[PDB]
Amino acid sequence: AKGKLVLGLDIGSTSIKMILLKEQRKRGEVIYALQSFGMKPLPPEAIVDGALMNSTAIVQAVQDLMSELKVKGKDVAIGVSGHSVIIKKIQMPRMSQDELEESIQWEAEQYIPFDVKDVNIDTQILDGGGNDATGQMDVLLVAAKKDMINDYTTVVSEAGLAPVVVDVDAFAVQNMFSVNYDVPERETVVLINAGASVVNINIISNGATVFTRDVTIGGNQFTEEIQKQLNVSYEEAEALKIGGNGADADAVVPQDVERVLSSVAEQVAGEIQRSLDFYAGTAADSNFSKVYLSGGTAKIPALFKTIEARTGVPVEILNPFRKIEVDNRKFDPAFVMDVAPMAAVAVGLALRRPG
Amino acid sequence: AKGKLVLGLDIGSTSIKMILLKEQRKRGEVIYALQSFGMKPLPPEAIVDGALMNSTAIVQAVQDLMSELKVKGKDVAIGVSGHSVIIKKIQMPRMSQDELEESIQWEAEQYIPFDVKDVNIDTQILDGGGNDATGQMDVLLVAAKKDMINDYTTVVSEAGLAPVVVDVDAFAVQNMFSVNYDVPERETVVLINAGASVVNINIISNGATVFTRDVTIGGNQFTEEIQKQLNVSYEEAEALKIGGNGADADAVVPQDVERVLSSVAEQVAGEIQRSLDFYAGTAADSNFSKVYLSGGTAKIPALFKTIEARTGVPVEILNPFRKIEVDNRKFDPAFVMDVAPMAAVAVGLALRRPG
Amino acid sequence: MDKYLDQFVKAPPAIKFGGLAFVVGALTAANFFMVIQPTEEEIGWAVAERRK
Amino acid sequence: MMIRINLLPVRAVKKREMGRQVLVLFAVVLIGAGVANYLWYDDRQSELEAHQAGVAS
Ligand SMILES: Nc1ncnc2c1ncn2[C@@H]1O[C@H](COP(=O)(O)OP(=O)(O)OP(=O)(O)O)[C@@H](O)[C@H]1O
Ligand SMILES: Nc1ncnc2c1ncn2[C@@H]1O[C@H](COP(=O)(O)OP(=O)(O)OP(=O)(O)O)[C@@H](O)[C@H]1O
Ligand SMILES: [Mg+2]
Ligand SMILES: [Mg+2]
């Protein structure tokens, strides 16, 4: 039933973020526009292995998010953990919708290392509106062990929220750039979301996803190596990462820190070259085009130049908030730009919510 | 039951427009003739993702349209959103009308990424009156998820209107030129309708549609890029587009604006070359002929010359209102010509309504 | 799941019919109560008359 | 030229249909409740006649 819902970053692991865009009126005209945004560091013990495992504490945190937001809306879209979802493509024959859903569940049964006991939702990589009966089916299945979804629904229920869409982050992060992707439509673009629990790669022709791949490595790895090499707590190692790696006065600390994070840098580069090579299936004589970054782990100083020179692709930060109207009297464009990578998904399923 | 109905531009997204043509008597002779026309900027939150999603507000707006029109008629033809309709061709065997409708639904079942739960309506690209039993069937299916149609019927119901035809814009825009197309009947013509939510291409031999293709890019993209690059609201960015791009005193602003819209220009051209190349299936050694433009996004200054040089086809504005009698004492031909591209469909399904 | 608070805030024939139906249901509740009460009153007049 | 008409399919169709069925169910329930109100009225008139016989007694 129509409200403009809301959007949290429920699988932030480092941070629970939430965004309210609705249609803001100006001079008799209206359009999607940022109304509020809030962010709180996730209190751990909330999430373990991608499952919400202190539904109570997470509830109270989400309530703090709603209060800081000053939002009256109580409907929400959210996302599952990348560690909690299996995403992969699947080839079938299209037919009746029931026969597809059953046949989909039958093929993915092979694909799921758990009982069902499992969440199945597909979408077709090409418009069904393009092919004849019995021919040329392609669906991608998102499958999730059951009570990741439960845990999240408990969290949402006691926060006073009502969920309408439980989406996935690798595609929700794309809704902000889906227009700017839709304008170049034979161009192959990569999108990396370097988070705290996982790094997702999704590669597209236009805003048409060609594939996705999720890598266990993330920013938690850099923080954990800093912590190892200076027997620090996770918080002070995290700050040493953030402010340590990027200050103008940091000239003495990129040896001490960079020598700590160098293994992670090499090995991340190795994983990304790994996935990219595992895609290049059909065009044995071509090259790449252009790619963007999201997630706070991206904001590692100089990491964009490093990925650019190492993967042979131009890797650029991007401002999601360009998709939405922003009142300059209520929001500073500079800070908005600063927190854009962390918030990409946080506005992602948020354009999913007035949709 | 025979009235001359009416016609709104219900999926204008930028503007709800409405037109009343009936048969105007002069000197004992009568003919189809413009009786009224009205236009109001669409209040947003009315339409989202091509569905009418504030049926109440849209109702009141349509009532304002009927009042500004001073029309007593309460029957209407309208159109669905291009984002809300799947249009594609389909090959079958012709037979009994029931066997065709069932077989059509069976083949398009493959073509629809939603349950049915879906609108199916076909028409034959060639006269059925040309082929023998079991042979040479071609229908084109218009399929629409169910309550786009519902939402529109609610809007129509509380506006006091009664719908008789729910047509599609890519073909409704053609009824104004269907005569002028019907006079050259081996000539391949392209028709672009650059709207605010979508750009449709339909290409014909005569007034016989050969195909259609809908592109997500539109004028909302140009406006949105202006807004991005000058942190403006959507309305002032839209005016900066309109008056900014076309005034005689605009000599300093096509650098500031054209540098903003240049990506959209390149990428639109890339989409149109894209579709055109994806058609050229059978005549590997031929060229194009002539093409027309409709929709207000077309009226971007110099865009016609740009598309003409870039696509290798003569792209020309056209005056729809030439199909209907216009009393010079009630309407200025100049202004009529000025608002012709926006109103092409708005008179389109309007010649559909006394038909 | 939006289009349904749009439909729930709107209405035309389905909800005009619906409202007519809730009204006739209320009126039938009313007349059934208004035939249950004369029952009780009637048993009362019985108890009086027999006592006479 | 292609002349297409998306009028009376489907969330319009099946919502006019659900709209019809819900009202038919209303009608049936109200007719039954009516019959009940009746049969009650008859047992009550019988009781009234017995009681008026007693009053005559
Ligand atoms: N300036 C910075 N330099 C280096 N690392 C940073 C910086 N800012 C944030 N990070 C890292 O980014 C991570 C948080 O980013 P973000 O909130 O986008 O990830 P997330 O979406 O919460 O994680 P996930 O979705 O993977 O659970 C943290 O691990 C943090 O250490
Ligand atoms: N002179 C102009 N220069 C540039 N753009 C213009 C001009 N006039 C109108 N437009 C643009 O055209 C669009 C409106 O045109 P029109 O009304 O024909 O589209 P529409 O039919 O309402 O949209 P759709 O059918 O795609 O929903 C607006 O986006 C507006 O910004
Ligand atoms: Mg994230
Ligand atoms: Mg239009």
PDB file of N, CA and C in Angstrom, chain A residues 65-133:
ATOM      1  N   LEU A  65      18.368   5.260  14.555  1.00  0.00           N
ATOM      2  CA  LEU A  65      18.446   5.785  13.197  1.00  0.00           C
ATOM      3  C   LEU A  65      17.191   6.577  12.834  1.00  0.00           C
ATOM      4  N   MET A  66      16.016   6.008  13.115  1.00  0.00           N
ATOM      5  CA  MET A  66      14.771   6.690  12.786  1.00  0.00           C
ATOM      6  C   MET A  66      14.631   7.994  13.565  1.00  0.00           C
ATOM      7  N   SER A  67      15.102   8.018  14.817  1.00  0.00           N
ATOM      8  CA  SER A  67      14.990   9.240  15.611  1.00  0.00           C
ATOM      9  C   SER A  67      15.938  10.322  15.104  1.00  0.00           C
ATOM     10  N   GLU A  68      17.206   9.966  14.876  1.00  0.00           N
ATOM     11  CA  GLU A  68      18.152  10.908  14.288  1.00  0.00           C
ATOM     12  C   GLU A  68      17.645  11.425  12.939  1.00  0.00           C
ATOM     13  N   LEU A  69      16.918  10.582  12.201  1.00  0.00           N
ATOM     14  CA  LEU A  69      16.397  11.001  10.908  1.00  0.00           C
ATOM     15  C   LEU A  69      15.256  12.004  11.042  1.00  0.00           C
ATOM     16  N   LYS A  70      14.492  11.931  12.134  1.00  0.00           N
ATOM     17  CA  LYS A  70      13.258  12.696  12.306  1.00  0.00           C
ATOM     18  C   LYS A  70      12.248  12.350  11.213  1.00  0.00           C
ATOM     19  N   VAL A  71      12.150  11.069  10.884  1.00  0.00           N
ATOM     20  CA  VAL A  71      11.272  10.578   9.831  1.00  0.00           C
ATOM     21  C   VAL A  71      10.037   9.949  10.459  1.00  0.00           C
ATOM     22  N   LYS A  72       8.870  10.224   9.863  1.00  0.00           N
ATOM     23  CA  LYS A  72       7.634   9.597  10.310  1.00  0.00           C
ATOM     24  C   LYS A  72       7.333   8.300   9.573  1.00  0.00           C
ATOM     25  N   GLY A  73       8.030   8.024   8.475  1.00  0.00           N
ATOM     26  CA  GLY A  73       7.751   6.816   7.721  1.00  0.00           C
ATOM     27  C   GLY A  73       8.204   5.573   8.475  1.00  0.00           C
ATOM     28  N   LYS A  74       7.414   4.505   8.343  1.00  0.00           N
ATOM     29  CA  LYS A  74       7.679   3.257   9.041  1.00  0.00           C
ATOM     30  C   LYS A  74       7.685   2.051   8.112  1.00  0.00           C
ATOM     31  N   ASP A  75       7.756   2.254   6.807  1.00  0.00           N
ATOM     32  CA  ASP A  75       7.976   1.182   5.851  1.00  0.00           C
ATOM     33  C   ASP A  75       9.394   1.282   5.307  1.00  0.00           C
ATOM     34  N   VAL A  76       9.969   0.131   4.953  1.00  0.00           N
ATOM     35  CA  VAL A  76      11.398   0.029   4.680  1.00  0.00           C
ATOM     36  C   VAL A  76      11.653  -1.017   3.600  1.00  0.00           C
ATOM     37  N   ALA A  77      12.626  -0.733   2.742  1.00  0.00           N
ATOM     38  CA  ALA A  77      13.333  -1.737   1.969  1.00  0.00           C
ATOM     39  C   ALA A  77      14.679  -1.925   2.649  1.00  0.00           C
ATOM     40  N   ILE A  78      15.240  -3.132   2.580  1.00  0.00           N
ATOM     41  CA  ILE A  78      16.580  -3.361   3.121  1.00  0.00           C
ATOM     42  C   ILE A  78      17.297  -4.381   2.254  1.00  0.00           C
ATOM     43  N   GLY A  79      18.470  -4.822   2.702  1.00  0.00           N
ATOM     44  CA  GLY A  79      19.265  -5.759   1.935  1.00  0.00           C
ATOM     45  C   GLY A  79      19.811  -6.867   2.812  1.00  0.00           C
ATOM     46  N   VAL A  80      20.092  -7.992   2.167  1.00  0.00           N
ATOM     47  CA  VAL A  80      20.717  -9.114   2.855  1.00  0.00           C
ATOM     48  C   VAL A  80      22.235  -8.977   2.797  1.00  0.00           C
ATOM     49  N   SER A  81      22.918  -9.755   3.640  1.00  0.00           N
ATOM     50  CA  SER A  81      24.371  -9.750   3.621  1.00  0.00           C
ATOM     51  C   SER A  81      24.876 -10.493   2.393  1.00  0.00           C
ATOM     52  N   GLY A  82      25.907  -9.933   1.753  1.00  0.00           N
ATOM     53  CA  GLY A  82      26.562 -10.640   0.667  1.00  0.00           C
ATOM     54  C   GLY A  82      27.087 -12.004   1.067  1.00  0.00           C
ATOM     55  N   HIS A  83      27.476 -12.168   2.334  1.00  0.00           N
ATOM     56  CA  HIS A  83      27.847 -13.471   2.862  1.00  0.00           C
ATOM     57  C   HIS A  83      26.638 -14.357   3.107  1.00  0.00           C
ATOM     58  N   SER A  84      25.436 -13.804   3.058  1.00  0.00           N
ATOM     59  CA  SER A  84      24.229 -14.561   3.346  1.00  0.00           C
ATOM     60  C   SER A  84      23.435 -14.914   2.097  1.00  0.00           C
ATOM     61  N   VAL A  85      23.893 -14.502   0.917  1.00  0.00           N
ATOM     62  CA  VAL A  85      23.161 -14.706  -0.324  1.00  0.00           C
ATOM     63  C   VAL A  85      24.069 -15.371  -1.348  1.00  0.00           C
ATOM     64  N   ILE A  86      23.529 -16.378  -2.027  1.00  0.00           N
ATOM     65  CA  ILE A  86      24.132 -16.976  -3.209  1.00  0.00           C
ATOM     66  C   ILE A  86      23.474 -16.341  -4.432  1.00  0.00           C
ATOM     67  N   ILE A  87      24.270 -15.669  -5.258  1.00  0.00           N
ATOM     68  CA  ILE A  87      23.802 -15.085  -6.509  1.00  0.00           C
ATOM     69  C   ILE A  87      24.515 -15.798  -7.645  1.00  0.00           C
ATOM     70  N   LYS A  88      23.753 -16.392  -8.559  1.00  0.00           N
ATOM     71  CA  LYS A  88      24.396 -16.896  -9.769  1.00  0.00           C
ATOM     72  C   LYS A  88      23.373 -17.035 -10.875  1.00  0.00           C
ATOM     73  N   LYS A  89      23.882 -17.084 -12.104  1.00  0.00           N
ATOM     74  CA  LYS A  89      23.044 -17.222 -13.281  1.00  0.00           C
ATOM     75  C   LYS A  89      22.661 -18.680 -13.507  1.00  0.00           C
ATOM     76  N   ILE A  90      21.609 -18.865 -14.299  1.00  0.00           N
ATOM     77  CA  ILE A  90      20.972 -20.154 -14.526  1.00  0.00           C
ATOM     78  C   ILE A  90      20.231 -20.105 -15.859  1.00  0.00           C
ATOM     79  N   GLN A  91      20.440 -21.135 -16.682  1.00  0.00           N
ATOM     80  CA  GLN A  91      19.853 -21.238 -18.011  1.00  0.00           C
ATOM     81  C   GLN A  91      18.732 -22.273 -17.994  1.00  0.00           C
ATOM     82  N   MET A  92      17.580 -21.916 -18.589  1.00  0.00           N
ATOM     83  CA  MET A  92      16.361 -22.725 -18.530  1.00  0.00           C
ATOM     84  C   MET A  92      15.597 -22.671 -19.854  1.00  0.00           C
ATOM     85  N   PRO A  93      14.362 -23.172 -19.906  1.00  0.00           N
ATOM     86  CA  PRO A  93      13.449 -22.747 -20.983  1.00  0.00           C
ATOM     87  C   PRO A  93      12.310 -21.884 -20.456  1.00  0.00           C
ATOM     88  N   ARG A  94      12.090 -20.684 -20.985  1.00  0.00           N
ATOM     89  CA  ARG A  94      10.944 -19.949 -20.473  1.00  0.00           C
ATOM     90  C   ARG A  94       9.648 -20.627 -20.904  1.00  0.00           C
ATOM     91  N   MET A  95       8.612 -20.428 -20.079  1.00  0.00           N
ATOM     92  CA  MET A  95       7.266 -20.963 -20.268  1.00  0.00           C
ATOM     93  C   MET A  95       6.250 -20.225 -19.394  1.00  0.00           C
ATOM     94  N   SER A  96       5.352 -20.979 -18.749  1.00  0.00           N
ATOM     95  CA  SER A  96       4.439 -20.403 -17.767  1.00  0.00           C
ATOM     96  C   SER A  96       5.229 -19.967 -16.536  1.00  0.00           C
ATOM     97  N   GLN A  97       4.710 -18.944 -15.851  1.00  0.00           N
ATOM     98  CA  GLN A  97       5.405 -18.389 -14.697  1.00  0.00           C
ATOM     99  C   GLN A  97       5.542 -19.427 -13.577  1.00  0.00           C
ATOM    100  N   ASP A  98       4.497 -20.231 -13.344  1.00  0.00           N
ATOM    101  CA  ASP A  98       4.604 -21.315 -12.362  1.00  0.00           C
ATOM    102  C   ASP A  98       5.639 -22.343 -12.792  1.00  0.00           C
ATOM    103  N   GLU A  99       5.595 -22.760 -14.059  1.00  0.00           N
ATOM    104  CA  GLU A  99       6.569 -23.738 -14.539  1.00  0.00           C
ATOM    105  C   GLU A  99       7.987 -23.188 -14.465  1.00  0.00           C
ATOM    106  N   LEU A 100       8.161 -21.878 -14.669  1.00  0.00           N
ATOM    107  CA  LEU A 100       9.490 -21.305 -14.486  1.00  0.00           C
ATOM    108  C   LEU A 100       9.901 -21.320 -13.022  1.00  0.00           C
ATOM    109  N   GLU A 101       9.016 -20.880 -12.125  1.00  0.00           N
ATOM    110  CA  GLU A 101       9.411 -20.807 -10.722  1.00  0.00           C
ATOM    111  C   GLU A 101       9.765 -22.193 -10.175  1.00  0.00           C
ATOM    112  N   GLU A 102       8.947 -23.197 -10.495  1.00  0.00           N
ATOM    113  CA  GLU A 102       9.270 -24.560 -10.109  1.00  0.00           C
ATOM    114  C   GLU A 102      10.576 -25.035 -10.736  1.00  0.00           C
ATOM    115  N   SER A 103      10.740 -24.841 -12.050  1.00  0.00           N
ATOM    116  CA  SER A 103      11.948 -25.314 -12.718  1.00  0.00           C
ATOM    117  C   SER A 103      13.183 -24.604 -12.174  1.00  0.00           C
ATOM    118  N   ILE A 104      13.028 -23.334 -11.821  1.00  0.00           N
ATOM    119  CA  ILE A 104      14.088 -22.538 -11.215  1.00  0.00           C
ATOM    120  C   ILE A 104      14.486 -23.129  -9.880  1.00  0.00           C
ATOM    121  N   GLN A 105      13.495 -23.406  -9.033  1.00  0.00           N
ATOM    122  CA  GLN A 105      13.778 -24.010  -7.740  1.00  0.00           C
ATOM    123  C   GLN A 105      14.426 -25.377  -7.909  1.00  0.00           C
ATOM    124  N   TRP A 106      14.042 -26.104  -8.962  1.00  0.00           N
ATOM    125  CA  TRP A 106      14.591 -27.432  -9.217  1.00  0.00           C
ATOM    126  C   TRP A 106      16.069 -27.360  -9.597  1.00  0.00           C
ATOM    127  N   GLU A 107      16.423 -26.414 -10.482  1.00  0.00           N
ATOM    128  CA  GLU A 107      17.826 -26.271 -10.865  1.00  0.00           C
ATOM    129  C   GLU A 107      18.674 -25.716  -9.728  1.00  0.00           C
ATOM    130  N   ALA A 108      18.189 -24.696  -9.021  1.00  0.00           N
ATOM    131  CA  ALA A 108      18.969 -24.134  -7.926  1.00  0.00           C
ATOM    132  C   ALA A 108      19.063 -25.083  -6.733  1.00  0.00           C
ATOM    133  N   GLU A 109      18.142 -26.050  -6.621  1.00  0.00           N
ATOM    134  CA  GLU A 109      18.276 -27.079  -5.588  1.00  0.00           C
ATOM    135  C   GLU A 109      19.669 -27.677  -5.622  1.00  0.00           C
ATOM    136  N   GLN A 110      20.152 -27.996  -6.826  1.00  0.00           N
ATOM    137  CA  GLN A 110      21.538 -28.380  -7.054  1.00  0.00           C
ATOM    138  C   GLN A 110      22.522 -27.339  -6.545  1.00  0.00           C
ATOM    139  N   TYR A 111      22.184 -26.055  -6.681  1.00  0.00           N
ATOM    140  CA  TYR A 111      23.057 -24.928  -6.362  1.00  0.00           C
ATOM    141  C   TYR A 111      23.093 -24.553  -4.881  1.00  0.00           C
ATOM    142  N   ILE A 112      22.313 -25.183  -4.012  1.00  0.00           N
ATOM    143  CA  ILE A 112      22.221 -24.650  -2.658  1.00  0.00           C
ATOM    144  C   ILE A 112      22.782 -25.696  -1.687  1.00  0.00           C
ATOM    145  N   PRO A 113      23.852 -25.392  -0.945  1.00  0.00           N
ATOM    146  CA  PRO A 113      24.361 -26.331   0.052  1.00  0.00           C
ATOM    147  C   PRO A 113      23.556 -26.396   1.343  1.00  0.00           C
ATOM    148  N   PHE A 114      22.297 -25.937   1.361  1.00  0.00           N
ATOM    149  CA  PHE A 114      21.405 -26.062   2.511  1.00  0.00           C
ATOM    150  C   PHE A 114      20.068 -26.644   2.078  1.00  0.00           C
ATOM    151  N   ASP A 115      19.321 -27.186   3.040  1.00  0.00           N
ATOM    152  CA  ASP A 115      17.931 -27.529   2.765  1.00  0.00           C
ATOM    153  C   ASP A 115      17.163 -26.311   2.265  1.00  0.00           C
ATOM    154  N   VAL A 116      15.976 -26.561   1.725  1.00  0.00           N
ATOM    155  CA  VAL A 116      15.064 -25.466   1.402  1.00  0.00           C
ATOM    156  C   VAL A 116      13.849 -25.598   2.305  1.00  0.00           C
ATOM    157  N   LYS A 117      13.776 -24.844   3.405  1.00  0.00           N
ATOM    158  CA  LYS A 117      14.837 -24.026   4.021  1.00  0.00           C
ATOM    159  C   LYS A 117      15.712 -23.044   3.196  1.00  0.00           C
ATOM    160  N   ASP A 118      15.187 -22.434   2.125  1.00  0.00           N
ATOM    161  CA  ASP A 118      15.994 -21.491   1.356  1.00  0.00           C
ATOM    162  C   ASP A 118      15.164 -20.594   0.451  1.00  0.00           C
ATOM    163  N   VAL A 119      15.597 -19.340   0.387  1.00  0.00           N
ATOM    164  CA  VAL A 119      14.966 -18.237  -0.324  1.00  0.00           C
ATOM    165  C   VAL A 119      15.347 -18.288  -1.791  1.00  0.00           C
ATOM    166  N   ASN A 120      14.352 -18.319  -2.666  1.00  0.00           N
ATOM    167  CA  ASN A 120      14.617 -18.272  -4.095  1.00  0.00           C
ATOM    168  C   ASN A 120      13.876 -17.106  -4.720  1.00  0.00           C
ATOM    169  N   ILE A 121      14.615 -16.247  -5.437  1.00  0.00           N
ATOM    170  CA  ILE A 121      14.040 -15.162  -6.235  1.00  0.00           C
ATOM    171  C   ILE A 121      14.905 -14.948  -7.473  1.00  0.00           C
ATOM    172  N   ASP A 122      14.263 -14.913  -8.643  1.00  0.00           N
ATOM    173  CA  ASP A 122      15.010 -14.789  -9.889  1.00  0.00           C
ATOM    174  C   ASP A 122      14.633 -13.510 -10.610  1.00  0.00           C
ATOM    175  N   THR A 123      15.540 -13.051 -11.472  1.00  0.00           N
ATOM    176  CA  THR A 123      15.142 -12.095 -12.500  1.00  0.00           C
ATOM    177  C   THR A 123      15.885 -12.410 -13.787  1.00  0.00           C
ATOM    178  N   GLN A 124      15.281 -12.063 -14.911  1.00  0.00           N
ATOM    179  CA  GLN A 124      15.808 -12.479 -16.201  1.00  0.00           C
ATOM    180  C   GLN A 124      16.831 -11.472 -16.712  1.00  0.00           C
ATOM    181  N   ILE A 125      18.046 -11.963 -17.000  1.00  0.00           N
ATOM    182  CA  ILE A 125      19.126 -11.090 -17.458  1.00  0.00           C
ATOM    183  C   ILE A 125      18.809 -10.401 -18.776  1.00  0.00           C
ATOM    184  N   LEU A 126      17.927 -10.978 -19.580  1.00  0.00           N
ATOM    185  CA  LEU A 126      17.422 -10.346 -20.782  1.00  0.00           C
ATOM    186  C   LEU A 126      15.910 -10.285 -20.668  1.00  0.00           C
ATOM    187  N   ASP A 127      15.325  -9.248 -21.255  1.00  0.00           N
ATOM    188  CA  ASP A 127      13.871  -9.161 -21.308  1.00  0.00           C
ATOM    189  C   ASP A 127      13.321 -10.478 -21.833  1.00  0.00           C
ATOM    190  N   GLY A 128      12.544 -11.157 -20.997  1.00  0.00           N
ATOM    191  CA  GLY A 128      11.663 -12.175 -21.518  1.00  0.00           C
ATOM    192  C   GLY A 128      10.938 -11.699 -22.762  1.00  0.00           C
ATOM    193  N   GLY A 129      10.643 -10.400 -22.836  1.00  0.00           N
ATOM    194  CA  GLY A 129       9.919  -9.863 -23.970  1.00  0.00           C
ATOM    195  C   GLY A 129      10.641  -9.987 -25.285  1.00  0.00           C
ATOM    196  N   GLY A 130      11.643 -10.867 -25.360  1.00  0.00           N
ATOM    197  CA  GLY A 130      12.472 -11.035 -26.543  1.00  0.00           C
ATOM    198  C   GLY A 130      12.559 -12.434 -27.158  1.00  0.00           C
ATOM    199  N   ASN A 131      11.902 -13.454 -26.598  1.00  0.00           N
ATOM    200  CA  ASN A 131      12.133 -14.834 -27.028  1.00  0.00           C
ATOM    201  C   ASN A 131      10.876 -15.720 -26.979  1.00  0.00           C
ATOM    202  N   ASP A 132      10.889 -16.775 -27.796  1.00  0.00           N
ATOM    203  CA  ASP A 132       9.720 -17.585 -28.082  1.00  0.00           C
ATOM    204  C   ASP A 132       9.644 -18.811 -27.176  1.00  0.00           C
ATOM    205  N   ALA A 133       8.448 -19.423 -27.142  1.00  0.00           N
ATOM    206  CA  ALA A 133       8.133 -20.451 -26.150  1.00  0.00           C
ATOM    207  C   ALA A 133       9.093 -21.624 -26.261  1.00  0.00           C
TER     208      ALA A 133
END
